Amino acid sequence: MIDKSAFVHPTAIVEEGASIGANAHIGPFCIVGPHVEIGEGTVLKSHVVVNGHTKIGRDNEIYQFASIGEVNQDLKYAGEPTRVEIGDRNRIRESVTIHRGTVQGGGLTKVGSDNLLMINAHIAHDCTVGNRCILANNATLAGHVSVDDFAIIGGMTAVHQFCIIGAHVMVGGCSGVAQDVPPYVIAQGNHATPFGVNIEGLKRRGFSREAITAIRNAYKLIYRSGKTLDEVKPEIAELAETYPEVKAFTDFFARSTRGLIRH
Amino acid sequence: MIDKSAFVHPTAIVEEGASIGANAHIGPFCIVGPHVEIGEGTVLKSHVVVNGHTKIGRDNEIYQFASIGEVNQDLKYAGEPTRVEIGDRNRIRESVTIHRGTVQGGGLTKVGSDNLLMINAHIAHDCTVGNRCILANNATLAGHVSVDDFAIIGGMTAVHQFCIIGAHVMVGGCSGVAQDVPPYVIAQGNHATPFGVNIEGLKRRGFSREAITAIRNAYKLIYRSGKTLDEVKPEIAELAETYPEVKAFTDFFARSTRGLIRH
Amino acid sequence: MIDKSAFVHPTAIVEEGASIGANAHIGPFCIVGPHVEIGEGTVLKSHVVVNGHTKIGRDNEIYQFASIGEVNQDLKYAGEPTRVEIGDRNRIRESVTIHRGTVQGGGLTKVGSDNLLMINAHIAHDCTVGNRCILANNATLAGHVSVDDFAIIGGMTAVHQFCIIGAHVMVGGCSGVAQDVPPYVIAQGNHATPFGVNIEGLKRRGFSREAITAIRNAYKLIYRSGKTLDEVKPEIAELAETYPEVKAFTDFFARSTRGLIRH
Ligand SMILES: CCCCCCCCCCC[C@@H](O)CC(=O)O[C@H]1[C@H](O)[C@@H](CO)O[C@H](OP(=O)(O)OP(=O)(O)OC[C@H]2O[C@@H](n3ccc(=O)[nH]c3=O)[C@H](O)[C@@H]2O)[C@@H]1NC(C)=O
Numbered sequence: 076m077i078d079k080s081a082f083v084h085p086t087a088i089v090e091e092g093a094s095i096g097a098n099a100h101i102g103p104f105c106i107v108g109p110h111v112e113i114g115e116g117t118v119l120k121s122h123v124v125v126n127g128h129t130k131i132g133r134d135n136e137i138y139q140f141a142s143i144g145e146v147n148q149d150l151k152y153a154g155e156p157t158r159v160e161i162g163d164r165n166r167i168r169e170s171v172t173i174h175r176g177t178v179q180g181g182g183l184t185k186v187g188s189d190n191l192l193m194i195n196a197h198i199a200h201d202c203t204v205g206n207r208c209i210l211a212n213n214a215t216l217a218g219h220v221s222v223d224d225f226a227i228i229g230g231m232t233a234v235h236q237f238c239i240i241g242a243h244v245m246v247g248g249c250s251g252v253a254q255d256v257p258p259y260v261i262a263q264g265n266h267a268t269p270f271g272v273n274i275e276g277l278k279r280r281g282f283s284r285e286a287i288t289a290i291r292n293a294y295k296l297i298y299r300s301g302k303t304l305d306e307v308k309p310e311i312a313e314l315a316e317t318y319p320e321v322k323a324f325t326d327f328f329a330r331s332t333r334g335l336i337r338h
Numbered sequence: 339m340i341d342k343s344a345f346v347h348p349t350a351i352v353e354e355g356a357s358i359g360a361n362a363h364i365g366p367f368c369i370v371g372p373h374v375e376i377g378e379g380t381v382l383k384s385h386v387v388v389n390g391h392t393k394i395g396r397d398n399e400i401y402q403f404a405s406i407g408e409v410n411q412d413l414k415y416a417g418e419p420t421r422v423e424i425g426d427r428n429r430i431r432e433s434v435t436i437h438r439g440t441v442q443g444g445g446l447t448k449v450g451s452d453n454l455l456m457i458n459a460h461i462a463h464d465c466t467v468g469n470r471c472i473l474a475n476n477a478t479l480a481g482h483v484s485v486d487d488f489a490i491i492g493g494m495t496a497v498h499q500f501c502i503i504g505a506h507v508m509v510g511g512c513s514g515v516a517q518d519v520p521p522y523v524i525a526q527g528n529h530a531t532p533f534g535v536n537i538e539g540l541k542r543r544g545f546s547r548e549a550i551t552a553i554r555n556a557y558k559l560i561y562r563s564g565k566t567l568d569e570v571k572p573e574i575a576e577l578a579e580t581y582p583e584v585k586a587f588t589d590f591f592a593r594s595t596r597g598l599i600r601h
Numbered sequence: 602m603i604d605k606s607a608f609v610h611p612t613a614i615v616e617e618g619a620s621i622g623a624n625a626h627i628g629p630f631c632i633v634g635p636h637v638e639i640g641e642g643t644v645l646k647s648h649v650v651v652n653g654h655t656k657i658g659r660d661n662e663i664y665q666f667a668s669i670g671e672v673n674q675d676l677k678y679a680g681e682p683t684r685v686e687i688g689d690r691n692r693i694r695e696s697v698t699i700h701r702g703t704v705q706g707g708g709l710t711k712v713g714s715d716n717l718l719m720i721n722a723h724i725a726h727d728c729t730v731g732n733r734c735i736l737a738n739n740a741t742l743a744g745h746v747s748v749d750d751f752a753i754i755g756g757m758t759a760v761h762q763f764c765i766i767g768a769h770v771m772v773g774g775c776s777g778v779a780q781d782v783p784p785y786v787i788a789q790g791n792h793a794t795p796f797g798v799n800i801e802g803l804k805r806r807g808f809s810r811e812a813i814t815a816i817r818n819a820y821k822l823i824y825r826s827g828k829t830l831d832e833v834k835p836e837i838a839e840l841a842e843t844y845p846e847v848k849a850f851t852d853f854f855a856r857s858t859r860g861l862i863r864h
């Protein structure tokens with residue numbers, strides 16, 4: 076059902092079954108499939124394709140030539156009715172592609188809220204993007220990639236399948252990420268390696284001087300002490316008993332499946 | 339002529355002269371020029387531009403914002419009526435560009451069958467793509483590039499003009515290819531260098547243990563023996579007298595014009 | 602006002618207020634905003650979006666899925682009425698994006714004349730592109746970048762914010778430019794470093810043997826003499842008293858704010 080306060084341009088094609096919220100705006104030459112939900116205040120500028128089982132939240136801005144909900148590029152996918160979920164207040168720029176999940180991968184591609192996805196960013200099947208993230212121009216996620224809250228990924232950078240980009244990470248431009256990046260780390264290169272703690276991001280986001288120091292000490296345990304990860308995990312858990320921000324490392328280790336980026 | 343069983347969306351523009359086969363589907367806001375042939379069962383999802391002297395085979399799927407047959411980017415091109423040929427059962431994803439040939443280059447851009455061309459892949463004027471190939475997101479071919487059967491090219495990778503990507507090659511992501519890549523080789527880096535034989539691809543595609551060993555021995559002749567290519571060519575031809583798969587090297591050497599990628 | 606000799610396709614949307622010059626051509630499914638000026642002979646092929654306060658000159662060719670004048674990607678931008686200016690005889694290929702300026706950056710994104718902007722090139726807010734430039738596929742400028750006359754930027758290359766690409770520069774493909782590139786230099790790598798003088802470009806563009814030698818001597822002063830830039834600046838000014846082409850270095854030094862690319 077199309078809310079009476081929504082605008083649908085006469086040249087747009089909204090298929091019966093689509094749900095369009097109050098004060099949404101569907102611009103010229105858009106296509107919206109029958110299983111799409113578009114939340115209140117969301118704008119599709121023009122020439123946008125949204126299809127599949129796809130739920131989009133409120134106050135998003137989706138620009139021309141973006142493709143949301145489309146068939147993914149996994150050769151294992153065979154047309155099953157998988158899903159895309161997108162949250163609120165995202166800016167989804169020209170030519171961005173966000174593909175539906177695969178049965179094998181859990182069936183869901185998810186994007187949170189307040190993200191900036193720049194021109195031609197790619198979010199593959201079964202990815203999970205959190206909140207307040209930035210993907211710069213042409214940043215490309217392979218299938219099953221996680222991008223955690225506040226992480227930023229620079230222009231022209233690609234991330235290999237299943238990798239985790241931890242919270243508050245900064246991945247430089249022109250990089251290739253082949254393994255998991257722990258929270259709070261700067262990564263860059265091809266393949267990307269660690270380059271210290273994203274101190275400036277943490278400072279701007281309200282982290283205390285004590286928390287940043289504890290995070291830097293956790294980084295040194297991982298990358299400078301010379302100990303194995305298994306030896307380091309209890310020491311990081313010990314540090315998190317005083318500095319709760321360090322618990323992000325613990326939670327990340329439990330999810331990591333590709334090993335950490337290394338020098 | 340438009341076959342009576344083809345579907346042409348009321349908002350699509352199919353110019354008189356275009357040939358549309360049985361059970362083809364031209365989606366909304368597509369444009370199909372007067373010299374285009376579209377084979378049986380081929381689907382243009384929406385917002386596709388196909389123009390020029392362009393013949394497309396059967397059962398292809400061409401996604402939104404793709405541009406097929408368009409004027410190429412060679413400054414030497416001046417509007418001559420050159421051609422594009424595309425075979426069967428290709429999946430041509432969002433924003434892919436396939437440009438027409440140049441008179442100087444032979445007049446033809448050719449793509450075979452069963453290929454996967456991912457988001458924003460680029461096939462320049464006078465390229466030749468074989469069968470069962472994959473170009474990952476943003477993979478970019480300069481003019482006159484050959485991509486032989488079963489070769490795969492990773493995300494964000496670019497190939498310099500006139501290079502040959504041999505059969506069953508794997509080119510890693512985030513690479514720049516500046517010379518010719520012999521069949522069966524793994525290449526990666528900027529500039530790309532050889533990294534052994536694509537053993538896993540050959541195994542999955544039915545190559546025998548004996549054939550793979552012979553191919554690996556041919557690789558060692560080229561890259562490990564320390565002999566010159568001219569010295570190695572007869573030894574590889576000798577090996578191909580027993581192992582016919584090795585003949586692919588011989589055929590590749592006759593076409594190569596930029597020298598081989600090297601350590 | 603739309604000139605009586607301009608063609609506007611029935612499916613295009615040209616908003617009242619737009620100015621369309623003689624013998625211009627607005628193709629199907631284009632959108633042209635009320636503050637756009639399109640000069641005589643300019644062609645929008647199809648599926649082009651032009652909006653914002655945007656002035657486009659004569660005899661340009663703008664291809665499908667390009668976005669010209671759009672809101673930029675700077676988080677500091679808040680909708681102010683900034684501008685785009687584009688000159689004459691540019692070829693602006695599929696999926697190119699040219700974004701409007703920011704108040705903080707001077708309010709203007711500017712492109713000159715006779716440029717080739719290949720598929721998915723990006724010109725960010727407040728950039729300045731001169732005349733006779735080439736941006737190859739996926740070449741990406743961050744905000745505030747200058748690309749001076751005759752410079753060429755290879756495929757997949759990105760330029761960090763505020764950098765200057767000097768006149769007659771050649772930046773290789775697959776590169777990342779993080780600092781300023783003096784006129785006449787070849788740059789490549791990640792990060793890009795200098796690789797001599799773009800002698801072949803200068804030769805083709807009519808530079809004398811004496812001018813090229815003087816330019817090469819200026820390059821050696823900067824990169825081989827071992828002197829500091831401040832020591833070298835007067836020696837280059839001294840050389841320009843005889844060879845006026847060397848004055849380009851002087852003018853570039855006065856604009857440079859990020860230091861020069863270095864070995
Ligand atoms: C420096 C890092 C650069 C990273 C660059 C990343 C660019 C990503 C672009 C976006 C892609 C995304 O939209 C889709 C995606 O990631 O899908 C894949 C899916 O996430 C995965 C897991 O579920 O499965 C698939 O990838 P795999 O590599 O695991 O697939 P595969 O085993 O079928 O191999 C794919 C092809 O490579 C061939 N191959 C594989 C291994 C090898 O050693 N040699 C070889 O030739 C193989 O024959 C086949 O043709 C999926 N692919 C395909 C083509 O099906």
Ligand SMILES: CCCCCCCCCCC[C@@H](O)CC(=O)O[C@H]1[C@H](O)[C@@H](CO)O[C@H](OP(=O)(O)OP(=O)(O)OC[C@H]2O[C@@H](n3ccc(=O)[nH]c3=O)[C@H](O)[C@@H]2O)[C@@H]1NC(C)=O
Pocket residue numbers: 410411412413414437460461462463478479480481482496497498499514515516529735737738753755756757770771774775799800801802803805
């Ligand atoms: C690590 C590897 C990275 C690879 C990146 C590849 C990215 C490819 C993107 C797709 C491009 C494809 O669609 C079109 C294409 O490849 O066309 C060219 C055509 O395949 C070729 C042969 O037929 O001829 C042309 O390339 P060339 O390099 O041979 O052309 P040219 O000699 O005219 O030089 C082009 C520009 O570079 C300048 N130049 C050249 C050499 C030099 O040393 N310095 C210099 O400035 C020269 O002045 C001119 O402005 C063609 N170009 C142009 C712009 O006309």
Ligand SMILES: CCCCCCCCCCC[C@@H](O)CC(=O)O[C@H]1[C@H](O)[C@@H](CO)O[C@H](OP(=O)(O)OP(=O)(O)OC[C@H]2O[C@@H](n3ccc(=O)[nH]c3=O)[C@H](O)[C@@H]2O)[C@@H]1NC(C)=O
Pocket residue numbers: 209211212227229230231244245248249273274275276277279673674675676677700723724725726741742743744745759760761762777778779792
């Ligand atoms: C090897 C080189 C690779 C180069 C790759 C270039 C790819 C360019 C793609 C085109 C982008 C272009 O269209 C827009 C652009 O360049 O805008 C920016 C604008 O030119 C700039 C100046 O005016 O200002 C902004 O860039 P800055 O980096 O200066 O912005 P910022 O300080 O707000 O930081 C942006 C994000 O990075 C985070 N950050 C910053 C620094 C740091 O150390 N850690 C960190 O996490 C910070 O929290 C924030 O979320 C602007 N960005 C944003 C996102 O607002």
Ligand SMILES: COc1cccc(Cl)c1C[C@@H]1COCCN1C(=O)c1cc(-c2cc(C)c(N)cn2)n[nH]1
Pocket residue numbers: 209210211212227228229230245246247248249263743761762779
């Ligand atoms: C550092 O800034 C980053 C880093 C990661 C993500 C994001 Cl979003 C940004 C914001 C910037 C500016 O806003 C547009 C997007 N940006 C970029 O993609 C980006 C990357 C680089 C860069 C520079 C250097 C010297 C190195 N070694 C690596 N990368 N320069 N610009």
Ligand SMILES: COc1cccc(Cl)c1C[C@@H]1COCCN1C(=O)c1cc(-c2cc(C)c(N)cn2)n[nH]1
Pocket residue numbers: 217235236253472473474475490491492493508509510511512526
């Ligand atoms: C290896 O997988 C390849 C290689 C070539 C072509 C293709 Cl099609 C693929 C399939 C994958 C997954 O399906 C989407 C497309 N893919 C990619 O582009 C790709 C490249 C890389 C990669 C990883 C490493 C560690 C290195 N050193 C280089 N490249 N990871 N993913």
Ligand SMILES: COc1cccc(Cl)c1C[C@@H]1COCCN1C(=O)c1cc(-c2cc(C)c(N)cn2)n[nH]1
Pocket residue numbers: 480498499516735736737738753754755756771772773774775789
């Ligand atoms: C050298 O040619 C350049 C360089 C800069 C800009 C432009 Cl426009 C061109 C024209 C070419 C051909 O016309 C399409 C665009 N081209 C490219 O982007 C491009 C870059 C490279 C390349 C090759 C090598 C060996 C290295 N080390 C770096 N880059 N090969 N092709």
